[PDB]
Design a protein around this ligand. Sequence first.
Ligand SMILES: CC(=O)N[C@@H]1[C@@H](O)[C@H](O[C@@H]2O[C@H](CO)[C@H](O)[C@H](O[C@]3(C(=O)O)C[C@H](O)[C@@H](NC(C)=O)[C@H]([C@H](O)[C@H](O)CO)O3)[C@H]2O)[C@@H](CO)O[C@H]1O
Ligand SMILES: CC(=O)N[C@@H]1[C@@H](O)[C@H](O[C@@H]2O[C@H](CO)[C@H](O)[C@H](O[C@]3(C(=O)O)C[C@H](O)[C@@H](NC(C)=O)[C@H]([C@H](O)[C@H](O)CO)O3)[C@H]2O)[C@@H](CO)O[C@H]1O
Ligand SMILES: [Ca+2]
Ligand SMILES: [Ca+2]
Ligand SMILES: [Ca+2]
Ligand SMILES: [Ca+2]
Length: 409
Amino acid sequence: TDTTPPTITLPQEVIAYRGEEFEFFVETTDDSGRVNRVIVRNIEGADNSTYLDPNWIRYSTDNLSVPGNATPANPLRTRVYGIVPINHGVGPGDRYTKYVRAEDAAGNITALVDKQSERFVLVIRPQTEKYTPQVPTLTYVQNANSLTQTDKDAVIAAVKSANPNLPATSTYSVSENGTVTITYPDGSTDTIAAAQTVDTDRVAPVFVDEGRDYIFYRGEEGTAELHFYDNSGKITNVNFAGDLAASSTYNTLLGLGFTFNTPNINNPNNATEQNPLVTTIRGTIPKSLPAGPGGKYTFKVRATDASGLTSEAKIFRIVFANQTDKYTPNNPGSLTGVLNPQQLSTSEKTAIEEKVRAANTGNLPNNVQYVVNNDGSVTVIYPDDTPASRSRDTITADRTVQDLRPRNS
Ligand SMILES: CC(=O)N[C@@H]1[C@@H](O)[C@H](O[C@@H]2O[C@H](CO)[C@H](O)[C@H](O[C@]3(C(=O)O)C[C@H](O)[C@@H](NC(C)=O)[C@H]([C@H](O)[C@H](O)CO)O3)[C@H]2O)[C@@H](CO)O[C@H]1O
Ligand SMILES: CC(=O)N[C@@H]1[C@@H](O)[C@H](O[C@@H]2O[C@H](CO)[C@H](O)[C@H](O[C@]3(C(=O)O)C[C@H](O)[C@@H](NC(C)=O)[C@H]([C@H](O)[C@H](O)CO)O3)[C@H]2O)[C@@H](CO)O[C@H]1O
Ligand SMILES: [Ca+2]
Ligand SMILES: [Ca+2]
Ligand SMILES: [Ca+2]
Ligand SMILES: [Ca+2]
């Protein structure tokens, strides 16, 4: 006859967080392979007792009283589960020792012995003891002792972003100096100290292209890309009219129809070292302005961050240049024969221009004017050429002309 009770395997300690659900499994086997009952109960009561408290601890066995439910390979599984009430205590006495018994098909039941037989300890802990908040990226403010409401909202957002595994219903408050209090649904809390959340914004925005000269070719549309970042990574305004003198040159550039575009000026995180704020200046220096010593505009630009720290006016220049500096003419594919190198005919000059034009398509601007001189050399005149600023190239006669006179005897 089967005279042996079943074997019960279960965790000795189960940590349950106040307000959340818990669940774990009891595994029961017997030598006979069959178990008829699994029970969870308080230690007190008679041998036949099934009384268990509190009401929220629950349990269930899905396959009781069947052959093969309880062997080494197909153990009987009992689910113990429930939801800890939201107002439960979390003091050292907020724990529960409950006893587990099993009975086989021949009636052998496991022994029940206070503090000695099969049992688990259910310990109730606050939700804060389950989570460890990640420190956020620093938020830079005007005054670390007295944050504004947009500073507080900026800290909360950066704490939320670094902690996406905190409970959905967690509430957050930021103190006057930035100290973050995370409050969990059970009322337990957590604090991020001001040192890890905020700092007084002390450094103004950096103009990366300080002292740069951007070459604009007269008569050709060009662009200049200006770069700024900030330690906060946020820039709220770029100013080109800081003082009367900067306001005048800048106003002069707008008169020529230049535009100034900063597409990400109203966005957050728009100005970091890696991904800097970009101002693009776009326009054409007309040919009426000549290149040379005074062919330039000196600008002073200032940028401000969200803490209102404005930088000291910094400098860049637009520098005018002639189209000749940018282009280099191709030589024609063959020379043109001339009866007299001293003085080319009209037809001779015409064939030369045809070949020089044909060799430069895709290289020089389509509206370049070629002047074939009397000696067969070629003046290339670019569209921006003016008396006050010449923009021309020369192709020498030895690249365009071939003597066709016969040789002596
Ligand atoms: C049989 C014998 O010699 N003596 C027992 C005596 O031990 C028993 O006291 C209960 O015994 C169990 C034994 O596992 C625990 O020690 C009970 O204490 C705890 C628990 O851990 O379950 C303490 C805990 O702080 C309490 N939790 C809370 C939130 O207060 C619980 C809780 O009150 C109980 O689980 C109630 O359901 O008790 C200990 O009380 C008593 C039986 O009453 O006397 C002999 O039977
Ligand atoms: C503020 C002070 O103490 N005195 C200012 C004096 O600085 C200012 O003179 C202008 O200063 C700016 C600097 O902000 C430039 O240096 C101006 O010179 C140039 C330039 O911008 O490089 C010279 C250049 O040849 C000019 N380019 C042209 C004509 O193509 C330009 C251009 O005329 C201006 O940028 C147009 O605004 O100027 C220099 O004139 C004067 C005038 O604002 O006011 C005093 O009070
Ligand atoms: Ca047995
Ligand atoms: Ca915590
Ligand atoms: Ca700053
Ligand atoms: Ca040239």
